[PDB]
Amino acid sequence: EKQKKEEILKTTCFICGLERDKFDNKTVTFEEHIKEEHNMWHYLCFIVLVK
Amino acid sequence: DFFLRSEDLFNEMNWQKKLRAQPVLYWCARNMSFWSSISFNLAVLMNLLVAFFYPFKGVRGGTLEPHWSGLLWTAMLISLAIVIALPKPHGIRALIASTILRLIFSVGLQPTLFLLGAFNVCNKIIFLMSFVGNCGTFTRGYRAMVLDVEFLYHLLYLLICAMGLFVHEFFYSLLLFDLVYREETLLNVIKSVTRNGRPIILTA
Amino acid sequence: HLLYLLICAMGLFVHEFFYSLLLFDLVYREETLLNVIKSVTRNGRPIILTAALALILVYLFSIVGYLFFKDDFILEVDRLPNETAGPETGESLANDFLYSDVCRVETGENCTSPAPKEELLPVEETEQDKEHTCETLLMCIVTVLSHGLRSGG
Amino acid sequence: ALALILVYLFSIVGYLFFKDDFILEVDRLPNETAGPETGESLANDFLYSDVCRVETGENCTSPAPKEELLPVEETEQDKEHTCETLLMCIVTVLSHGLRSGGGVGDVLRKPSKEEPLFAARVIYDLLFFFMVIIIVLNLIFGVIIDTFADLRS
Amino acid sequence: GVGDVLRKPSKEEPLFAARVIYDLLFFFMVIIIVLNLIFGVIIDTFADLRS
Amino acid sequence: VKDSTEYTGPESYVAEMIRERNLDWFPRMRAMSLVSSDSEGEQNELRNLQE
């Protein structure tokens, strides 16, 4: 699941985106992213108011 | 994708928261009271180290702060006698004051209305009842003291417990390990095992 | 050849095993020669704390050792308601429961030883062991750490 | 070879290391003592011684030919007196320490209170053998399983 | 290992080194292996079905 | 110087730074064409559309 926080990396917011962007143009996306948120813021604004 | 819604719611919440946040507170809270929080962890470090020095006698043993209270040397020159008045007072006091006031004023109308809020007021539950559990596990409570320084012382407390038985037990320890359970909520992997742990203890 | 020486010592230390000091630190260079080693270390940060976990469960165990009913007239109571048972048958028975409780506490501690002329007693008793415990706290902890990190047991 | 080395250092830090002598302590011073205050305590111081020586040785041887009764009896025999030293201690730590730590059969008593006396070669023992056993395993074990996840990958 | 021991050290040992190096090398490799095999292959299969 | 371229741126660147360078672118073509088709694009569009 922490190799699926990449949507936040991516884108966011817006939605997704993308981016992608384109580039781009203007714008880019981024910015957008930035922007977104714002948105919301816006919303718130819206609411506030109303008016 | 978603984102948104959631976101939205958340946002609203946021818104409210924012509103609250703004407002504021007063003073405040948040912080300064988080100084109080982290150094509360330092306090559990302390009842940790001193529970090692079980009540009766003893002045030969000891442990460095390391980078905070220099008053600890004063705390240990009368040692456990006034440890029936060191972790227990500064601990319960700093924590109830500081951390209840912040953890409740930062959030005390907020959780309304979402399930992550139901969980964070569950944090209100664990933190509050476990630590009043702790305050009730030293002071009597209620109150005491503290301041500085002184003085120291103490007283008581106690209350109730007992019835029936339970009649009389090892109240102090009760305090100890539940605090280190707070240290357990401090981080991660622990939760990891638990979660996959559901219909999996059945594998046991 | 020569020488050388220078210075060382012062103071002590005065004189030690200087030569060995040399030995193992060199084989530590052999340790920097390659890889997986680093691997463990890196994830190793706030993760030895996980060792601190069990270290704590044994700190609670230690006081729940020779220190816990059922098996006294309290719871039972609771139971009551319941008581017883118822118806018916068948068968049965019755029942009841018981109780007791209470106790105590205590405390203690102490210790120481020484011787000087007591030495016969230590040379005999150093050879000795017996599983009488004999309590208490720093004992029980050091021990539960001992065997309980050997192979429970 | 890693753990093989950690045991090569262990081997010389065996019956070969204070605390437990007037140096450280010283340282402490410053511291011283303690303081204040109380409480209780005691015282303290410391111590010382140181020184020583060284030585050387070686040687051885044985043868026979007609000594044989002594070997036929003593082949049957064993006793946990060590009795040192180096190639011994290494072969042994490799022995039991690759069986299932465990530790040296030598014990290691006179507790009293506020212990370094134990804490010396017990904290020494279980820290070493624990880290090195969990590691010799989780290494060779884990790296091989990891490679498995690789080829299946 | 076998309950039999396996003494008369003296120095510069083959006497030991015979069935001790024999013992711990064998039982070590084969235990770490019987484990890390059956163990590891099963866990690996777990990672597979969860995959 | 130179211038142109260178310067341118470177220078510035340086100065300054951032871025420058680258883114894416380169080459282729685209365009071309494609731009070349754009070249025919202006090469026929405006031509017929003025003529």
Coordinates of all heavy atoms in Angstrom, one line a residue, chain B residues 19-76, unseen atoms left out:
Chain B
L19 CA -13.6 27.5 13.1
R20 CA -12.3 26.6 16.5
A21 CA -8.7 26.7 15.3
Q22 CA -8.6 30.4 15.3
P23 CA -9.9 31.2 18.8
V24 CA -7.0 31.5 21.2
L25 CA -6.2 29.9 24.6
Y26 CA -5.5 31.8 27.8
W27 CA -1.7 31.5 27.9
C28 CA -1.2 29.2 24.8
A29 CA -1.8 25.7 23.6
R30 CA -0.1 24.6 20.4
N31 CA 3.6 24.4 21.2
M32 N 4.2 24.3 23.6 CA 5.0 23.8 24.7 C 4.5 22.5 25.4 O 5.3 21.7 25.9 CB 4.9 24.9 25.8 CG 3.5 25.3 26.2 SD 3.4 26.9 27.0 CE 3.3 28.0 25.6
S33 N 3.2 22.2 25.3 CA 2.7 21.0 25.9 C 3.1 19.8 25.1 O 2.8 18.7 25.5 CB 1.2 21.1 26.1 OG 0.8 22.1 27.0
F34 N 3.6 20.0 23.9 CA 4.2 18.9 23.2 C 5.6 18.7 23.7 O 6.1 17.6 23.6 CB 4.2 19.2 21.7 CG 2.9 19.3 21.1 CD1 2.6 19.9 19.9 CD2 1.8 18.7 21.8 CE1 1.3 20.0 19.4 CE2 0.5 18.7 21.2 CZ 0.3 19.4 20.0
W35 N 6.2 19.7 24.3 CA 7.4 19.4 25.1 C 6.8 18.5 26.2 O 7.4 17.5 26.5 CB 8.0 20.7 25.8 CG 8.7 21.7 25.0 CD1 8.7 21.8 23.7 CD2 9.4 22.8 25.5 NE1 9.4 23.0 23.3 CE2 9.9 23.6 24.4 CE3 9.8 23.2 26.8 CZ2 10.6 24.7 24.6 CZ3 10.6 24.4 27.0 CH2 11.0 25.1 25.9
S36 N 5.6 18.9 26.7 CA 5.1 18.1 27.7 C 4.8 16.6 27.3 O 4.9 15.7 28.1 CB 3.8 18.7 28.3 OG 4.0 20.0 28.8
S37 N 4.5 16.5 26.0 CA 4.1 15.2 25.5 C 5.3 14.3 25.3 O 5.4 13.2 25.8 CB 3.4 15.3 24.2 OG 3.1 14.1 23.6
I38 N 6.3 14.9 24.6 CA 7.5 14.1 24.3 C 8.3 13.8 25.6 O 8.9 12.8 25.7 CB 8.4 14.9 23.3 CG1 8.9 16.2 23.9 CG2 7.7 15.2 22.0 CD1 10.3 16.2 24.4
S39 N 8.2 14.8 26.5 CA 8.9 14.6 27.8 C 8.0 13.7 28.7 O 8.5 13.3 29.7 CB 9.3 15.9 28.4 OG 10.2 16.6 27.6
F40 N 6.8 13.6 28.3 CA 6.0 12.6 29.0 C 6.5 11.2 28.6 O 6.6 10.3 29.4 CB 4.5 12.7 28.8 CG 3.8 11.6 29.6 CD1 3.4 11.9 30.9 CD2 3.5 10.4 29.0 CE1 2.7 10.9 31.6 CE2 2.8 9.5 29.7 CZ 2.4 9.7 31.0
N41 N 6.8 11.1 27.3 CA 7.4 9.9 26.9 C 8.8 9.7 27.6 O 9.2 8.6 27.9 CB 7.7 9.9 25.4 CG 8.1 8.5 24.8 OD1 8.6 7.7 25.5 ND2 7.9 8.3 23.5
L42 N 9.4 10.8 27.9 CA 10.6 10.8 28.7 C 10.3 10.3 30.1 O 11.1 9.6 30.7 CB 11.3 12.1 28.7 CG 12.7 12.2 29.3 CD1 13.7 11.4 28.5 CD2 13.2 13.6 29.5
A43 N 9.1 10.6 30.6 CA 8.7 10.2 31.9 C 8.5 8.7 31.9 O 8.8 8.1 32.9 CB 7.4 11.0 32.3
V44 N 7.9 8.2 30.9 CA 7.7 6.8 30.8 C 9.0 6.1 30.7 O 9.2 4.9 31.1 CB 6.7 6.4 29.8 CG1 5.5 7.3 29.8 CG2 7.3 6.4 28.4
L45 N 10.0 6.8 30.1 CA 11.4 6.4 30.1 C 11.8 6.3 31.5 O 12.6 5.4 31.9 CB 12.3 7.3 29.3 CG 13.8 7.0 29.1 CD1 14.2 7.6 27.8 CD2 14.6 7.7 30.3
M46 N 11.3 7.2 32.4 CA 11.8 7.2 33.7 C 11.2 6.2 34.6 O 12.0 5.5 35.3 CB 11.6 8.6 34.3 CG 12.3 9.7 33.5 SD 14.1 9.4 33.5 CE 14.6 10.7 32.4
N47 N 9.9 6.0 34.6 CA 9.3 5.0 35.4 C 9.8 3.6 34.9 O 9.9 2.6 35.6 CB 7.8 5.0 35.5 CG 7.2 4.7 34.2 OD1 7.8 4.7 33.1 ND2 5.9 4.3 34.2
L48 N 10.1 3.6 33.6 CA 10.7 2.5 33.0 C 12.0 2.2 33.8 O 12.0 1.2 34.5 CB 11.0 2.8 31.5 CG 11.6 1.8 30.5 CD1 11.0 2.0 29.2 CD2 13.1 2.0 30.4
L49 N 12.9 3.1 33.7 CA 14.2 2.8 34.3 C 14.2 2.6 35.8 O 15.0 1.9 36.3 CB 15.2 4.0 34.0 CG 15.0 5.4 34.4 CD1 15.3 5.7 35.9 CD2 15.8 6.4 33.5
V50 N 13.2 3.2 36.5 CA 13.3 3.1 38.0 C 12.5 1.9 38.5 O 12.8 1.4 39.5 CB 12.7 4.4 38.6 CG1 11.2 4.5 38.3 CG2 12.9 4.4 40.1
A51 N 11.5 1.4 37.7 CA 10.8 0.2 38.1 C 11.8 -0.9 38.1 O 11.6 -1.9 38.8 CB 9.7 -0.1 37.1
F52 N 12.9 -0.7 37.4 CA 14.0 -1.6 37.4 C 14.6 -1.7 38.8 O 15.1 -2.7 39.3 CB 15.1 -1.2 36.4 CG 14.6 -1.0 35.0 CD1 15.4 -0.4 34.1 CD2 13.4 -1.5 34.6 CE1 15.0 -0.2 32.7 CE2 12.9 -1.3 33.3 CZ 13.7 -0.7 32.4
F53 N 14.5 -0.5 39.4 CA 15.1 -0.4 40.8 C 14.0 -0.6 41.8 O 13.5 0.4 42.3 CB 15.8 0.9 41.0 CG 16.9 1.2 39.9 CD1 17.3 2.5 39.7 CD2 17.4 0.2 39.2 CE1 18.3 2.8 38.8 CE2 18.4 0.4 38.3 CZ 18.8 1.7 38.0
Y54 N 13.6 -1.9 42.0 CA 12.4 -2.2 42.7 C 12.5 -1.6 44.1 O 13.5 -1.6 44.7 CB 12.2 -3.7 42.8 CG 11.0 -4.1 43.5 CD1 9.7 -4.1 42.9 CD2 11.1 -4.5 44.8 CE1 8.6 -4.5 43.6 CE2 9.9 -4.9 45.5 CZ 8.7 -4.9 44.9 OH 7.6 -5.3 45.6
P55 N 11.3 -1.1 44.6 CA 11.3 -0.5 46.0 C 11.7 -1.5 47.1 O 11.3 -2.6 47.1 CB 9.8 -0.1 46.1 CG 9.1 -1.0 45.1 CD 10.0 -1.0 44.0
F56 N 12.4 -0.9 48.1 CA 13.0 -1.5 49.3 C 14.2 -0.6 49.7 O 14.1 0.1 50.7 CB 13.6 -3.0 49.0 CG 12.5 -4.0 49.1 CD1 12.7 -5.2 48.5 CD2 11.3 -3.8 49.7 CE1 11.7 -6.2 48.5 CE2 10.3 -4.7 49.8 CZ 10.5 -6.0 49.2
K57 N 15.3 -0.8 49.0 CA 16.5 0.0 49.3 C 17.1 0.6 48.0 O 16.4 1.1 47.2 CB 17.6 -0.9 49.9 CG 17.2 -1.5 51.2 CD 18.4 -2.4 51.7 CE 18.1 -3.0 53.0 NZ 19.2 -3.9 53.5
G58 N 18.4 0.6 47.9 CA 19.1 0.9 46.6 C 19.4 2.4 46.4 O 18.6 3.2 46.5
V59 N 20.7 2.7 46.2 CA 21.2 4.0 45.8 C 22.3 3.9 44.8 O 22.7 4.8 44.1 CB 21.7 4.8 47.0 CG1 20.5 5.2 47.9 CG2 22.8 4.1 47.7
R60 N 22.9 2.7 44.7 CA 24.0 2.4 43.7 C 23.6 2.6 42.3 O 24.4 3.1 41.5 CB 24.5 1.0 43.9 CG 25.6 0.6 42.9 CD 25.9 -0.9 43.0 NE 26.6 -1.2 44.3 CZ 26.8 -2.4 44.7 NH1 26.5 -3.5 43.9 NH2 27.5 -2.6 45.8
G61 N 22.4 2.2 41.9 CA 22.0 2.2 40.5 C 21.6 3.6 40.0 O 21.5 4.5 40.8
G62 N 21.5 3.7 38.7 CA 21.1 5.0 38.1 C 21.1 5.0 36.6 O 21.5 4.1 36.0
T63 N 20.6 6.1 36.1 CA 20.6 6.3 34.6 C 20.5 7.8 34.2 O 19.8 8.5 34.9 CB 19.4 5.5 34.0 OG1 19.5 4.1 34.3 CG2 19.4 5.6 32.5
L64 N 21.2 8.1 33.2 CA 21.2 9.5 32.7 C 19.9 9.9 32.0 O 19.2 9.1 31.5 CB 22.4 9.7 31.8 CG 23.8 10.0 32.5 CD1 24.3 8.8 33.3 CD2 24.9 10.5 31.5
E65 N 19.7 11.2 32.0 CA 18.4 11.8 31.6 C 17.9 11.5 30.2 O 16.7 11.0 30.0 CB 18.4 13.3 31.8 CG 17.1 14.0 31.5 CD 16.1 13.8 32.5 OE1 16.4 13.4 33.6 OE2 14.9 14.2 32.3
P66 N 18.7 11.6 29.1 CA 20.0 12.3 29.0 C 20.0 13.8 28.8 O 20.8 14.5 29.5 CB 20.6 11.6 27.7 CG 19.4 11.3 26.9 CD 18.2 11.0 27.9
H67 N 19.1 14.3 27.9 CA 19.2 15.7 27.5 C 18.1 16.6 28.0 O 17.5 17.3 27.2 CB 19.3 15.8 26.0 CG 19.8 17.1 25.5 ND1 18.9 18.2 25.4 CD2 20.9 17.6 25.1 CE1 19.5 19.2 24.9 NE2 20.8 18.9 24.7
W68 N 17.7 16.4 29.3 CA 16.6 17.2 29.9 C 16.9 17.5 31.3 O 17.8 18.1 31.7 CB 15.3 16.6 29.6 CG 14.8 16.6 28.2 CD1 14.2 17.6 27.6 CD2 15.0 15.6 27.2 NE1 14.0 17.3 26.3 CE2 14.5 16.0 26.0 CE3 15.6 14.3 27.3 CZ2 14.5 15.2 24.9 CZ3 15.6 13.5 26.1 CH2 15.1 14.0 25.0
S69 N 16.0 17.0 32.2 CA 16.0 17.3 33.6 C 17.3 16.9 34.3 O 17.7 15.7 34.3 CB 14.9 16.6 34.3 OG 13.6 17.0 33.9
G70 N 18.0 17.9 34.8 CA 19.2 17.6 35.6 C 18.8 17.4 37.0 O 19.6 17.0 37.9
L71 N 17.5 17.6 37.3 CA 16.9 17.5 38.6 C 16.8 16.0 39.0 O 16.5 15.7 40.1 CB 15.6 18.2 38.7 CG 14.4 17.8 37.8 CD1 13.7 16.6 38.3 CD2 13.5 19.0 37.6
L72 N 17.0 15.2 38.0 CA 16.9 13.8 38.2 C 17.9 13.3 39.2 O 17.6 12.3 40.0 CB 17.1 13.0 36.9 CG 17.0 11.5 37.0 CD1 15.5 11.2 37.4 CD2 17.4 10.8 35.7
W73 N 19.0 13.9 39.3 CA 20.0 13.5 40.3 C 19.5 13.8 41.7 O 19.7 13.0 42.6 CB 21.3 14.3 40.0 CG 22.5 13.8 40.9 CD1 23.3 12.8 40.8 CD2 22.9 14.5 42.1 NE1 24.2 12.7 41.8 CE2 24.0 13.7 42.7 CE3 22.5 15.6 42.8 CZ2 24.7 14.1 43.8 CZ3 23.1 16.0 44.0 CH2 24.2 15.2 44.5
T74 N 18.8 14.9 41.8 CA 18.1 15.2 43.1 C 17.0 14.2 43.3 O 16.7 13.8 44.4 CB 17.5 16.6 43.1 OG1 16.5 16.7 42.0 CG2 18.5 17.6 42.8
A75 N 16.4 13.7 42.2 CA 15.3 12.8 42.3 C 15.8 11.4 42.7 O 15.0 10.6 43.2 CB 14.6 12.7 41.0
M76 N 17.1 11.2 42.5 CA 17.6 9.9 42.8 C 18.5 9.9 44.1 O 18.9 8.8 44.5 CB 18.4 9.3 41.6 CG 19.6 10.0 41.3 SD 20.4 9.1 39.9 CE 21.0 7.7 40.7

